[PDB]
Amino acid sequence: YASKAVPHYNRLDSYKVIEQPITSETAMKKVEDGNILVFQVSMKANKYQIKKAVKELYEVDVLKVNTLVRPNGTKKAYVRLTADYDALDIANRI
RNA sequence: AAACUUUCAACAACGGAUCUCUUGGUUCUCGCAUCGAUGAAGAACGCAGCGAAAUGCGAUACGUAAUGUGAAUUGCAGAAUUCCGUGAAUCAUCGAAUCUUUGAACGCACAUUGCGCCCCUUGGUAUUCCAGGGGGCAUGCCUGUUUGAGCGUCAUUU
DSSP, X not given: OOOSOOOOSOOOOXXXXXXXXXXXXXXXXXXXXXXXXXXXXXXXXXXXXXXXXXXXXXOSOOSOOXXXXXXXXXXXXXXXXXXXXXXGGGTTOO
């Protein structure tokens, strides 16, 4: 193969990428009785991305991630936590 | 005699005509030369602290930059916390950007967000398997480049 021109710039990025701490009435409960953080996402959710995300951002660790495509556009995730993260405990953030 | 019924008065009442209103329309005339593979026209889906739509905009989302205007407020003064003498959302701006998923549509598809192949770089750590970010693989022709094809055919030291 070969070349002599190209694309442009590494734009971007593309990642980020965990939405807005989707937490309400029942959600808090999740992060309570169960210890499973109810964040949200960007519909184009890269999936195990979410893992890498939380596992990076909030950084504690997670075990499952079942993630419904809520009736809104809201693509909200259902994350858990190994013996570490104690929910309300890792609810220093929210 | 009333009720009723017609009739004409005034008052309401149904209705929205007449009058006057005009950021429309309609027809005139006079300049002007520009779309797209450098991804167009069009479509979705989204983007405000608060928004349904018309409007503007694209994950940098009613907007970034840059100018001059500005000189003082914008989405102007809806409210609202709002924030300001180092220049605020307005005009111009197109000597910059961002420009999702698409559409001439483009690797294959596409009643799905489905299915492959390279190259670079991260984790598992043997390149060859699985996940993350970046760059990429349509067609017809133009021209050169670069490999190989025939008993088209030339000549060579055998």
